[PDB]
């Protein structure tokens, strides 16, 4: 019996400046109720970096979790692509 | 072709306008009738007529209406396909309907579609409501209609290769 799977995203680091954390822009993007065309929205999440192994402009996965502080509910999974 | 008018026709009228011309003396009036004419087997037409009187106007209108006749496909007592007729800021959509609906249409559109022999029409005027331009719009929408037999003959095809 493998337990239930938590929500996962991939995104892009906005800031590094908070102590051991980052914020992450998920760019999933969707259409209207009325006009039907598909428009974009950027969702920035607070995510934990326990090693602080991040940079601004980094494609990264995040896992959701228990609330780690105020506004934090996410952590790192696999830092995919590094900034240049 | 030009439909030769030797049929039995029902010839009911939409409007007679009273229609003026100003002279040195003053206003001089005439009556401009437009009348829709056709049997209920698929031939429709309409015509304008002007005179000092009402009945001579209806005479000239029924004559000019018998001159110009049009044909309409009556596929299953309806029209074959939905169409918008657009003569000059009169725009009228026409849908085929089911067998119970009756002619759903406003006054002059209803006169065209009842004197056409078409029995089940959904329709709506999406433009100006003068009778003359609405009747021209209806007959524009009924001239551009297409028969399934004729379109099957047009595509180098057969009817059952269209209809299913």
């Amino acid at each position: 019996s493998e337990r239930n799977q938590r929500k996962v995203y991939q995104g892009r680091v906005v800031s590094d400046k908070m102590d051991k954390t980052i914020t992450v822009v998920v760019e999933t993007y969707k259409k209207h109720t009325l006009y039907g065309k598909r428009v974009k929205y950027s969702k920035k999440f607070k995510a934990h970096d326990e090693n602080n192994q991040a940079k601004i402009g980094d494609i990264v996965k995040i896992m959701e979790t228990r609330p780690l502080s105020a506004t934090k509910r996410f952590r790192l999974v696999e830092v995919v692509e590094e900034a240049v | 072709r030009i439909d030769p008018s030797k049929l039995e026709l029902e010839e009911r009228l939409v409007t007679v306008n009273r229609v003026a011309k100003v002279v040195k003396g003053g206003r001089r009036f005439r009556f401009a009738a437009l009348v829709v004419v056709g049997d209920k087997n698929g031939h429709v037409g309409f015509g304008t007529g002007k005179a000092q009187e009402v009945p001579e106007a209806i005479r000239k209108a029924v004559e000019d209406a018998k001159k110009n006749l049009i044909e309409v496909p009556m596929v299953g007592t309806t029209i074959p396909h939905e169409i918008i007729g657009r003569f000059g800021a009169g725009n009228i959509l026409l849908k085929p309907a089911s067998e119970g609906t009756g002619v759903i249409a406003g006054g002059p559109v209803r006169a065209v579609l009842e004197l056409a022999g078409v029995a089940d029409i959904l329709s709506k005027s999406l433009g100006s409501n003068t009778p003359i331009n609405m009747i021209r719009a209806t007959l524009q929408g009924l001239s551009e209609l297409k028969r399934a037999e004729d379109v099957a003959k047009l595509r180098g095809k057969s009817v059952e290769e269209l209809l299913g």
Binding site: - | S98, E99, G100, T101, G102, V103, I104, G107, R110, A119
Partner: protein, 195 residues
């Protein structure tokens, strides 16, 4: 209810007989025997709608709800509405031949009781399904009005079968609208309630 007046205004024999239009075919009233003008589209649709609803004597609440329920059935719309008003039970009594009008057949269903498949029906607007043997109870077994309308012989329509003595009215498949009424123009009434 005069009900000659309704017929001569609507211009139709609503019984269907040489009465009520002979000697006076104009509409009613002080503006009637003069040459009346023809009616518009609205007037023609009203004439045909009220031809039908004054045949059957219906108020427009029941008449509209049967129009709607007939729309919920299949086929052609104005045919199905004719069929539903020819399943109406006053019409069943007057077309079995148990009354001379539909008012007398209304009083038969209302109080001078008549029975469907058993117990009773006190209600004129009862829609009669097929297969239903319609008769009278042993109390009103053969009394003077049903007795007269038995003495008088009308045709039984082919969507009915009717006995004289046993007096049970039984049915067939469905009343086809070719059989129902020649004079009432359906699908002007569909157009009247299309607006």
């Amino acid at each position: 209810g005069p009900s000659w007046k309704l017929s001569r205004r609507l211009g139709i024999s609503l019984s269907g007989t040489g009465k009520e239009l002979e000697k006076r075919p104009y509409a009613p009233g002080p503006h009637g025997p003069g040459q009346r003008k023809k009616l518009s589209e609205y007037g023609l649709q009203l004439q045909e709608k009220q031809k039908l609803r004054h045949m059957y004597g219906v108020n427009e609440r029941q008449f509209r709800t049967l129009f709607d329920k007939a729309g919920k059935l299949a086929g052609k719309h104005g045919e199905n509405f004719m069929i539903l008003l020819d399943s109406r039970l006053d019409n069943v009594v007057y077309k079995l031949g148990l009354a001379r009008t539909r008012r007398q057949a209304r009083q038969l269903v209302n109080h001078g009781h008549i029975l469907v498949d058993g117990s009773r029906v006190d209600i004129p607007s009862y829609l009669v399904k097929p297969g239903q043997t319609i008769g009278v109870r042993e109390k009103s077994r053969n009394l003077s009005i049903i007795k007269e309308s038995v003495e008088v012989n009308n045709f039984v329509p082919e969507y009915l079968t009717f006995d004289a003595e046993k007096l049970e009215g039984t049915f067939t498949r469905l009343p086809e609208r070719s059989e129902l009424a020649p004079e009432i123009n359906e699908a002007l009434i569909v157009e009247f309630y299309s607006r």
